[PDB]
Design an enzyme around this catalytic site. Structure first.
Site, PDB file in Angstrom:
ATOM      1  N   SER A 131       0.867  -1.209   0.000  1.00 33.01           N
ATOM      2  CA  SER A 131       0.000   0.000   0.000  1.00 33.01           C
ATOM      3  C   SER A 131       0.889   1.240   0.000  1.00 33.01           C
ATOM      4  CB  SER A 131      -1.021  -0.109   1.102  1.00 33.01           C
ATOM      5  OG  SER A 131      -2.079   0.814   0.963  1.00 33.01           O
ATOM      6  N   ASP A 177      -9.978  -4.383  -4.285  1.00 29.85           N
ATOM      7  CA  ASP A 177      -9.341  -3.414  -3.355  1.00 29.85           C
ATOM      8  C   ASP A 177     -10.230  -2.174  -3.256  1.00 29.85           C
ATOM      9  OD1 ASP A 177      -7.614  -1.665  -1.956  1.00 29.85           O
ATOM     10  OD2 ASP A 177      -5.843  -2.777  -2.768  1.00 29.85           O
ATOM     11  N   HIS A 208      -7.843  -5.569  -0.197  1.00 32.43           N
ATOM     12  CA  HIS A 208      -6.605  -4.774  -0.040  1.00 32.43           C
ATOM     13  C   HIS A 208      -5.495  -5.609   0.627  1.00 32.43           C
ATOM     14  CE1 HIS A 208      -4.196  -1.253   0.011  1.00 32.43           C
ATOM     15  NE2 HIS A 208      -4.167  -1.183   1.397  1.00 32.43           N
TER      16      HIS A 208
END
EC number: 3.1.1.101
Length: 262
Positions: A131, A177, A208
């Protein structure tokens, strides 16, 4: 200039929870420019191995990314998983801290008391992360083109323009996601890169966290991560097919690749 270590690979040997080498680890006593680190290393690689630095996402800790340590180290890498100075660090700070962790792995390689004393080829380094840590890996790659490989997961940055990157870059994406949507993050980032070997592997129905510790696709994601780092960090042409191939799996909702010979 190639650095072939361990046996000839098979789909089975790369999908397996453990590679050929025995792994040990330690906590970094005095972290230099980052919060905390665990170093994972092969005891019996039979040569010096490249180093990979792995950064978590916003609020997250080493536990989110820890599975990569033993998975990669067991195929012949030194892997440092970090906590950031703050769980709330942004991607530029995460990049600085990733490069600081590689720097300290180099320092420990030169420290006679360290368990990784003379185990590292400091000329061969890679970057991974989730991320904002994935954003940080791409920033690390854009700022340090001598990095041999990057393999971020569900990357997010405030900018998707990584057009300067020449480092071989594998992006893990998570189809569903809702934190860093594929259509506004992972894919535009992937699309911006015209100068490098690159790959995009999207996990079918993935949230995610689809490449984190405790994911249900560790055989496939582990095989791809290991193959990418072996091909590009070691220049090990035995992994050309594993690194570059469409894995042809119903767990993959999207596969893209460019400048990647089989």
């Amino acid at each position: 200039g190639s650095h072939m270590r361990g046996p000839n690979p098979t789909a089975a040997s790369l999908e397996a929870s453990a590679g050929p080498f025995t792994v040990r680890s330690f906590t970094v006593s005095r972290p230099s420019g980052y919060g905390a680190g665990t170093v994972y290393y092969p005891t019996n690689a039979g040569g010096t191995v490249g180093a990979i630095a792995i950064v978590p996402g916003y609020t997250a800790r080493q536990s989110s990314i820890k599975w990569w340590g033993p998975r990669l180290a067991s195929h012949g890498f030194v892997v440092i998983t970090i906590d950031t100075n703050s769980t709330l660090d942004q991607p530029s700070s995460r990049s600085s801290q990733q490069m600081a962790a590689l720097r300290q792995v180099a320092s420990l390689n030169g420290t006679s008391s360290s368990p990784i004393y003379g185990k590292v080829d400091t000329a061969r380094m890679g970057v991974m992360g989730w991320s904002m840590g994935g954003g940080g890996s791409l920033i690390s790659a854009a700022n340090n083109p001598s990095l041999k490989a990057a393999a971020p997961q569900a990357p997010w940055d405030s900018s998707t323009n990584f057009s300067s990157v020449t480092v071989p870059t594998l992006i893990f994406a998570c189809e569903n996601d809702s934190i860093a949507p594929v259509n506004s993050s992972a894919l535009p980032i992937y699309d911006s890169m015209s100068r490098n070997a690159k790959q995009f592997l999207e996990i079918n129905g993935g949230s995610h966290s689809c490449a984190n510790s405790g994911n249900s696709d560790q055989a496939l994601i582990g095989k791809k991560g290991v193959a990418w780092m072996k091909r590009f960090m070691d220049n090990d042409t035995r992994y050309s097919t594993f690194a570059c191939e469409n894995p042809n799996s119903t767990r993959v909702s999207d596969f893209r690749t460019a400048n990647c010979s089989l």
